[PDB]
Amino acid sequence: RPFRPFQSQYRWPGVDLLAYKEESAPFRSVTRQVLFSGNGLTGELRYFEVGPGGHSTLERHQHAHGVMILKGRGHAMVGRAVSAVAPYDLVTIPGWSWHQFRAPADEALGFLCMVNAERDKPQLPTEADLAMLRADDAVAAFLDGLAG
Amino acid sequence: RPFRPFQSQYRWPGVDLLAYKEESAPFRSVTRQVLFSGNGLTGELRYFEVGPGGHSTLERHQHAHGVMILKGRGHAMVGRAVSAVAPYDLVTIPGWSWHQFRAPADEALGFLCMVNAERDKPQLPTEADLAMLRADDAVAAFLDGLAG
Ligand SMILES: [Mn+2]
Ligand SMILES: [Mn+2]
Protein backbone atom coordinates (compact mmCIF):
# COMPACT_ATOMS: atom_id res chain seq x y z
CA ARG A 1 0.00 0.00 0.00
CA PRO A 2 2.54 2.76 -0.74
CA PHE A 3 0.23 3.76 -3.65
CA ARG A 4 -3.54 4.10 -3.20
CA PRO A 5 -4.98 5.46 -6.49
CA PHE A 6 -7.92 7.85 -6.68
CA GLN A 7 -11.06 6.72 -8.51
CA SER A 8 -14.25 8.78 -8.88
CA GLN A 9 -17.50 6.86 -9.58
CA TYR A 10 -20.55 7.92 -11.48
CA ARG A 11 -23.88 7.43 -9.70
CA TRP A 12 -27.45 8.58 -9.90
CA PRO A 13 -28.85 8.08 -6.36
CA GLY A 14 -32.17 6.22 -6.48
CA VAL A 15 -30.85 3.90 -9.23
CA ASP A 16 -29.51 0.60 -7.81
CA LEU A 17 -25.87 -0.36 -8.22
CA LEU A 18 -25.13 -3.96 -9.18
CA ALA A 19 -21.54 -4.93 -8.37
CA TYR A 20 -20.81 -8.29 -10.02
CA LYS A 21 -19.48 -11.06 -7.75
CA GLU A 22 -16.01 -12.25 -8.90
CA GLU A 23 -14.67 -15.75 -8.09
CA SER A 24 -13.34 -18.22 -12.26
CA ALA A 25 -15.31 -15.15 -13.52
CA PRO A 26 -15.07 -13.99 -17.21
CA PHE A 27 -15.39 -10.33 -16.07
CA ARG A 28 -13.35 -8.18 -13.65
CA SER A 29 -14.25 -4.98 -11.63
CA VAL A 30 -17.63 -4.29 -13.20
CA THR A 31 -20.71 -2.46 -11.96
CA ARG A 32 -23.96 -1.69 -13.70
CA GLN A 33 -26.74 0.82 -13.20
CA VAL A 34 -29.99 0.78 -15.20
CA LEU A 35 -30.85 4.31 -16.09
CA PHE A 36 -33.92 3.78 -18.20
CA SER A 37 -36.19 0.74 -18.44
CA GLY A 38 -40.01 0.36 -18.32
CA ASN A 39 -42.47 3.17 -19.30
CA GLY A 40 -43.29 1.28 -22.53
CA LEU A 41 -39.73 2.05 -23.65
CA THR A 42 -38.74 -0.96 -25.73
CA GLY A 43 -35.07 -0.07 -25.04
CA GLU A 44 -32.91 -0.11 -21.89
CA LEU A 45 -30.17 2.37 -21.10
CA ARG A 46 -27.51 1.05 -18.74
CA TYR A 47 -24.26 2.48 -17.42
CA PHE A 48 -21.33 0.17 -16.99
CA GLU A 49 -18.25 1.09 -15.05
CA VAL A 50 -15.13 -0.99 -15.45
CA GLY A 51 -12.48 -0.46 -12.75
CA PRO A 52 -8.75 -0.09 -13.56
CA GLY A 53 -7.31 -3.23 -15.22
CA GLY A 54 -10.81 -4.71 -15.51
CA HIS A 55 -12.88 -5.95 -18.44
CA SER A 56 -16.43 -6.76 -19.46
CA THR A 57 -17.25 -10.34 -20.40
CA LEU A 58 -15.96 -11.36 -23.90
CA GLU A 59 -19.27 -12.44 -25.40
CA ARG A 60 -21.72 -12.38 -28.29
CA HIS A 61 -25.49 -12.59 -28.72
CA GLN A 62 -28.27 -11.86 -31.19
CA HIS A 63 -29.19 -8.43 -29.88
CA ALA A 64 -27.27 -5.29 -30.95
CA HIS A 65 -25.63 -2.80 -28.58
CA GLY A 66 -25.18 0.92 -29.01
CA VAL A 67 -22.35 2.09 -26.67
CA MET A 68 -21.38 5.66 -25.85
CA ILE A 69 -18.23 6.07 -23.78
CA LEU A 70 -19.01 8.26 -20.84
CA LYS A 71 -16.04 8.23 -18.47
CA GLY A 72 -12.29 7.60 -18.55
CA ARG A 73 -10.76 5.77 -21.51
CA GLY A 74 -9.82 2.26 -22.50
CA HIS A 75 -10.06 -0.16 -25.39
CA ALA A 76 -12.86 -2.01 -27.18
CA MET A 77 -13.02 -4.91 -29.53
CA VAL A 78 -15.95 -5.58 -31.86
CA GLY A 79 -15.52 -8.46 -34.27
CA ARG A 80 -11.87 -8.02 -35.16
CA ALA A 81 -11.87 -4.23 -34.93
CA VAL A 82 -9.81 -3.08 -31.90
CA SER A 83 -9.89 0.61 -30.99
CA ALA A 84 -8.92 2.96 -28.19
CA VAL A 85 -12.04 4.67 -26.83
CA ALA A 86 -12.72 7.85 -24.84
CA PRO A 87 -15.75 10.05 -23.98
CA TYR A 88 -18.11 10.32 -25.86
CA ASP A 89 -17.13 7.85 -28.60
CA LEU A 90 -19.82 5.65 -30.17
CA VAL A 91 -19.24 1.95 -30.42
CA THR A 92 -21.76 0.02 -32.55
CA ILE A 93 -21.96 -3.67 -31.84
CA PRO A 94 -24.00 -5.64 -34.43
CA GLY A 95 -25.76 -8.86 -33.50
CA TRP A 96 -23.40 -11.77 -32.99
CA SER A 97 -20.14 -9.82 -32.95
CA TRP A 98 -17.65 -10.82 -30.24
CA HIS A 99 -17.15 -7.84 -28.00
CA GLN A 100 -15.25 -6.68 -24.93
CA PHE A 101 -14.32 -3.42 -23.16
CA ARG A 102 -11.05 -3.09 -21.34
CA ALA A 103 -9.97 -0.54 -18.77
CA PRO A 104 -6.32 0.59 -18.66
CA ALA A 105 -4.29 -0.36 -15.52
CA ASP A 106 -4.50 3.23 -14.22
CA GLU A 107 -8.09 4.36 -14.99
CA ALA A 108 -11.72 3.27 -14.80
CA LEU A 109 -13.82 3.00 -18.04
CA GLY A 110 -17.45 4.12 -17.95
CA PHE A 111 -19.93 3.75 -20.81
CA LEU A 112 -23.62 3.87 -21.64
CA CYS A 113 -25.09 0.79 -23.28
CA MET A 114 -28.42 0.77 -25.05
CA VAL A 115 -30.04 -2.65 -25.69
CA ASN A 116 -33.53 -4.01 -26.44
CA ALA A 117 -35.62 -4.81 -23.31
CA GLU A 118 -36.54 -8.21 -24.83
CA ARG A 119 -33.30 -9.98 -25.76
CA ASP A 120 -31.34 -13.29 -25.74
CA LYS A 121 -28.76 -14.50 -23.14
CA PRO A 122 -25.02 -13.82 -23.87
CA GLN A 123 -22.81 -16.68 -25.05
CA LEU A 124 -19.21 -17.07 -23.92
CA PRO A 125 -16.45 -18.31 -26.24
CA THR A 126 -15.37 -21.98 -26.41
CA GLU A 127 -11.70 -22.86 -26.69
CA ALA A 128 -12.25 -23.01 -30.49
CA ASP A 129 -13.80 -19.53 -30.52
CA LEU A 130 -10.87 -18.05 -28.57
CA ALA A 131 -8.37 -19.62 -30.94
CA MET A 132 -10.13 -18.19 -34.06
CA LEU A 133 -10.22 -14.81 -32.31
CA ARG A 134 -6.54 -15.07 -31.37
CA ALA A 135 -5.53 -15.76 -35.01
CA ASP A 136 -5.74 -11.98 -35.48
CA ASP A 137 -2.70 -10.20 -34.00
CA ALA A 138 -4.44 -7.05 -32.75
CA VAL A 139 -7.18 -9.20 -31.15
CA ALA A 140 -4.67 -11.43 -29.33
CA ALA A 141 -2.80 -8.22 -28.32
CA PHE A 142 -6.08 -6.79 -26.97
CA LEU A 143 -6.97 -9.98 -25.05
CA ASP A 144 -3.45 -10.12 -23.58
CA GLY A 145 -3.95 -6.61 -22.11
CA LEU A 146 -1.51 -5.01 -24.53
CA ALA A 147 -3.63 -2.79 -26.78
CA GLY A 148 -2.06 0.51 -25.45
CA ARG B 1 -21.25 42.96 -32.03
CA PRO B 2 -19.09 44.15 -29.11
CA PHE B 3 -19.71 40.68 -27.57
CA ARG B 4 -19.35 37.48 -29.60
CA PRO B 5 -19.80 34.53 -27.19
CA PHE B 6 -17.92 31.25 -27.49
CA GLN B 7 -19.92 28.05 -28.05
CA SER B 8 -18.42 24.57 -28.46
CA GLN B 9 -20.58 21.95 -30.28
CA TYR B 10 -20.68 18.23 -29.84
CA ARG B 11 -20.38 16.17 -33.03
CA TRP B 12 -19.61 12.66 -34.13
CA PRO B 13 -18.40 13.01 -37.76
CA GLY B 14 -20.22 10.54 -40.02
CA VAL B 15 -23.53 11.19 -38.20
CA ASP B 16 -25.67 13.82 -39.99
CA LEU B 17 -26.56 17.08 -38.31
CA LEU B 18 -30.15 18.29 -38.67
CA ALA B 19 -30.46 22.03 -37.95
CA TYR B 20 -34.17 22.89 -37.69
CA LYS B 21 -35.44 25.70 -39.93
CA GLU B 22 -36.90 28.58 -37.85
CA GLU B 23 -39.51 31.00 -39.25
CA SER B 24 -43.64 31.12 -36.38
CA ALA B 25 -41.64 28.08 -35.11
CA PRO B 26 -42.40 26.48 -31.66
CA PHE B 27 -38.66 25.70 -31.21
CA ARG B 28 -35.53 27.90 -31.22
CA SER B 29 -31.79 27.09 -31.92
CA VAL B 30 -32.08 23.31 -32.06
CA THR B 31 -30.01 20.64 -33.77
CA ARG B 32 -30.30 16.88 -33.67
CA GLN B 33 -27.97 14.00 -34.38
CA VAL B 34 -29.10 10.35 -34.42
CA LEU B 35 -26.48 8.30 -32.71
CA PHE B 36 -28.08 4.89 -32.78
CA SER B 37 -30.95 3.62 -34.93
CA GLY B 38 -31.38 0.43 -37.01
CA ASN B 39 -29.50 -2.86 -36.30
CA GLY B 40 -32.74 -4.40 -34.96
CA LEU B 41 -32.47 -1.94 -32.06
CA THR B 42 -36.07 -1.13 -31.19
CA GLY B 43 -34.81 2.13 -29.59
CA GLU B 44 -33.24 5.31 -31.01
CA LEU B 45 -30.57 7.37 -29.29
CA ARG B 46 -30.48 11.01 -30.36
CA TYR B 47 -28.46 14.01 -29.24
CA PHE B 48 -30.16 17.35 -29.09
CA GLU B 49 -28.29 20.59 -28.74
CA VAL B 50 -30.18 23.71 -27.77
CA GLY B 51 -28.31 26.98 -28.36
CA PRO B 52 -28.23 29.82 -25.78
CA GLY B 53 -31.72 31.24 -25.08
CA GLY B 54 -33.29 28.44 -27.14
CA HIS B 55 -35.88 25.77 -26.37
CA SER B 56 -37.21 22.47 -27.62
CA THR B 57 -40.84 22.31 -28.75
CA LEU B 58 -43.37 22.29 -25.83
CA GLU B 59 -45.17 19.08 -26.71
CA ARG B 60 -46.61 15.73 -25.62
CA HIS B 61 -47.15 12.32 -27.20
CA GLN B 62 -47.82 8.69 -26.32
CA HIS B 63 -44.22 7.52 -26.39
CA ALA B 64 -41.92 7.93 -23.36
CA HIS B 65 -38.52 9.67 -23.39
CA GLY B 66 -35.47 8.91 -21.33
CA VAL B 67 -33.19 12.02 -21.30
CA MET B 68 -29.64 12.26 -20.02
CA ILE B 69 -28.15 15.75 -19.94
CA LEU B 70 -24.84 15.68 -21.70
CA LYS B 71 -23.62 19.25 -22.11
CA GLY B 72 -24.05 22.67 -20.50
CA ARG B 73 -27.02 23.28 -18.21
CA GLY B 74 -30.54 24.63 -18.41
CA HIS B 75 -34.06 23.88 -17.27
CA ALA B 76 -36.65 21.20 -17.99
CA MET B 77 -40.33 20.86 -17.42
CA VAL B 78 -42.16 17.54 -17.30
CA GLY B 79 -45.83 17.69 -16.40
CA ARG B 80 -45.72 20.41 -13.76
CA ALA B 81 -42.29 19.50 -12.40
CA VAL B 82 -39.75 22.23 -13.29
CA SER B 83 -36.09 21.55 -12.53
CA ALA B 84 -32.64 22.92 -13.28
CA VAL B 85 -30.61 20.29 -15.14
CA ALA B 86 -26.89 19.66 -15.72
CA PRO B 87 -24.67 16.78 -16.96
CA TYR B 88 -25.44 13.88 -16.53
CA ASP B 89 -28.89 14.28 -14.94
CA LEU B 90 -31.67 11.87 -15.92
CA VAL B 91 -35.01 13.26 -16.94
CA THR B 92 -37.82 10.69 -17.30
CA ILE B 93 -40.71 11.78 -19.45
CA PRO B 94 -43.77 9.47 -19.22
CA GLY B 95 -46.21 9.15 -22.10
CA TRP B 96 -48.42 12.20 -22.54
CA SER B 97 -46.56 14.55 -20.21
CA TRP B 98 -46.02 18.09 -21.51
CA HIS B 99 -42.32 18.66 -21.79
CA GLN B 100 -39.75 21.26 -22.78
CA PHE B 101 -36.00 21.93 -22.39
CA ARG B 102 -34.70 25.44 -22.08
CA ALA B 103 -31.18 26.75 -22.51
CA PRO B 104 -30.00 29.70 -20.38
CA ALA B 105 -29.23 32.99 -22.22
CA ASP B 106 -25.48 32.39 -21.87
CA GLU B 107 -25.00 28.64 -22.55
CA ALA B 108 -26.01 25.83 -24.89
CA LEU B 109 -27.89 22.75 -23.50
CA GLY B 110 -27.01 19.32 -24.87
CA PHE B 111 -28.82 16.08 -24.00
CA LEU B 112 -29.26 12.48 -25.09
CA CYS B 113 -32.81 11.35 -25.78
CA MET B 114 -33.81 7.72 -26.02
CA VAL B 115 -37.18 6.95 -27.71
CA ASN B 116 -38.87 3.95 -29.36
CA ALA B 117 -38.14 3.61 -33.12
CA GLU B 118 -41.88 3.09 -33.77
CA ARG B 119 -43.75 6.00 -32.20
CA ASP B 120 -46.56 8.60 -32.61
CA LYS B 121 -46.26 12.24 -33.87
CA PRO B 122 -45.86 15.03 -31.23
CA GLN B 123 -48.85 17.24 -30.41
CA LEU B 124 -48.50 20.95 -29.71
CA PRO B 125 -50.59 22.75 -27.08
CA THR B 126 -53.85 24.59 -27.91
CA GLU B 127 -54.61 27.92 -26.28
CA ALA B 128 -56.60 25.94 -23.66
CA ASP B 129 -53.63 23.65 -22.97
CA LEU B 130 -51.27 26.62 -22.47
CA ALA B 131 -53.70 28.25 -20.06
CA MET B 132 -54.02 25.07 -17.91
CA LEU B 133 -50.22 24.81 -17.94
CA ARG B 134 -49.85 28.48 -16.99
CA ALA B 135 -52.16 28.06 -13.96
CA ASP B 136 -49.10 26.69 -12.16
CA ASP B 137 -46.71 29.48 -11.12
CA ALA B 138 -43.41 27.62 -11.64
CA VAL B 139 -44.63 26.45 -15.09
CA ALA B 140 -45.60 29.98 -16.19
CA ALA B 141 -42.23 31.17 -14.76
CA PHE B 142 -40.46 28.48 -16.82
CA LEU B 143 -42.35 29.33 -20.03
CA ASP B 144 -41.63 33.03 -19.53
CA GLY B 145 -37.86 32.27 -19.48
CA LEU B 146 -37.54 32.99 -15.78
CA ALA B 147 -36.77 29.64 -14.15
CA GLY B 148 -33.18 30.68 -13.09
MN1 LIG C 1 -23.21 -8.06 -24.71
MN1 LIG D 1 -41.16 14.75 -27.37
Side-chain angles (χ1 to χ4, degrees), chain A residues 2-20 22-120 122-148, chain B residues 2-20 22-120 122-148:
Chain A
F3 304 97
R4 291 167 298 159
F6 171 76
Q7 143 168 24
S8 54
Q9 301 163 348
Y10 284 18
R11 300 297 186 262
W12 291 261
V15 160
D16 300 328
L17 182 83
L18 170 56
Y20 289 108
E22 285 153 58
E23 300 166 321
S24 85
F27 46 76
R28 197 178 155 188
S29 315
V30 182
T31 71
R32 177 190 70 162
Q33 294 170 78
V34 178
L35 307 184
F36 295 112
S37 64
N39 277 299
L41 282 157
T42 51
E44 286 181 23
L45 189 72
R46 296 97 56 83
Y47 169 74
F48 287 88
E49 201 161 66
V50 182
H55 60 253
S56 45
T57 304
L58 177 61
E59 68 189 40
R60 75 180 168 185
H61 39 63
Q62 192 282 327
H63 59 277
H65 283 295
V67 171
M68 182 193 261
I69 312 306
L70 191 76
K71 169 185 182 198
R73 58 170 189 97
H75 288 87
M77 68 156 304
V78 6
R80 34 196 56 227
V82 172
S83 194
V85 295
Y88 306 107
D89 294 344
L90 311 169
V91 186
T92 295
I93 307 169
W96 302 109
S97 284
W98 293 113
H99 61 274
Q100 189 175 56
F101 292 85
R102 282 190 182 253
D106 69 301
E107 196 158 4
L109 176 60
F111 58 85
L112 301 180
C113 182
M114 184 180 78
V115 290
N116 294 333
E118 292 311 312
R119 65 181 182 275
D120 63 319
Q123 289 165 235
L124 326 167
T126 62
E127 201 69 77
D129 290 321
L130 275 172
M132 188 164 88
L133 248 7
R134 292 194 152 267
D136 193 303
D137 281 343
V139 171
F142 169 93
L143 295 169
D144 285 333
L146 290 149
Chain B
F3 304 97
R4 291 167 298 159
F6 171 76
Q7 143 168 24
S8 54
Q9 301 163 348
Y10 284 18
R11 300 297 186 262
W12 291 261
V15 160
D16 300 328
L17 182 83
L18 170 56
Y20 289 108
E22 285 153 58
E23 300 166 321
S24 85
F27 46 76
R28 197 178 155 188
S29 315
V30 182
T31 71
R32 177 190 70 162
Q33 294 170 78
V34 178
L35 307 184
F36 295 112
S37 64
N39 277 299
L41 282 157
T42 51
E44 286 181 23
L45 189 72
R46 296 97 56 83
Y47 169 74
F48 287 88
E49 201 161 66
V50 182
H55 60 253
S56 45
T57 304
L58 177 61
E59 68 189 40
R60 75 180 168 185
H61 39 63
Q62 192 282 327
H63 59 277
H65 283 295
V67 171
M68 182 193 261
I69 312 306
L70 191 76
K71 169 185 182 198
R73 58 170 189 97
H75 288 87
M77 68 156 304
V78 6
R80 34 196 56 227
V82 172
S83 194
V85 295
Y88 306 107
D89 294 344
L90 311 169
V91 186
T92 295
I93 307 169
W96 302 109
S97 284
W98 293 113
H99 61 274
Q100 189 175 56
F101 292 85
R102 282 190 182 253
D106 69 301
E107 196 158 4
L109 176 60
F111 58 85
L112 301 180
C113 182
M114 184 180 78
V115 290
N116 294 333
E118 292 311 312
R119 65 181 182 275
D120 63 319
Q123 289 165 235
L124 326 167
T126 62
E127 201 69 77
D129 290 321
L130 275 172
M132 188 164 88
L133 248 7
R134 292 194 152 267
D136 193 303
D137 281 343
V139 171
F142 169 93
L143 295 169
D144 285 333
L146 290 149

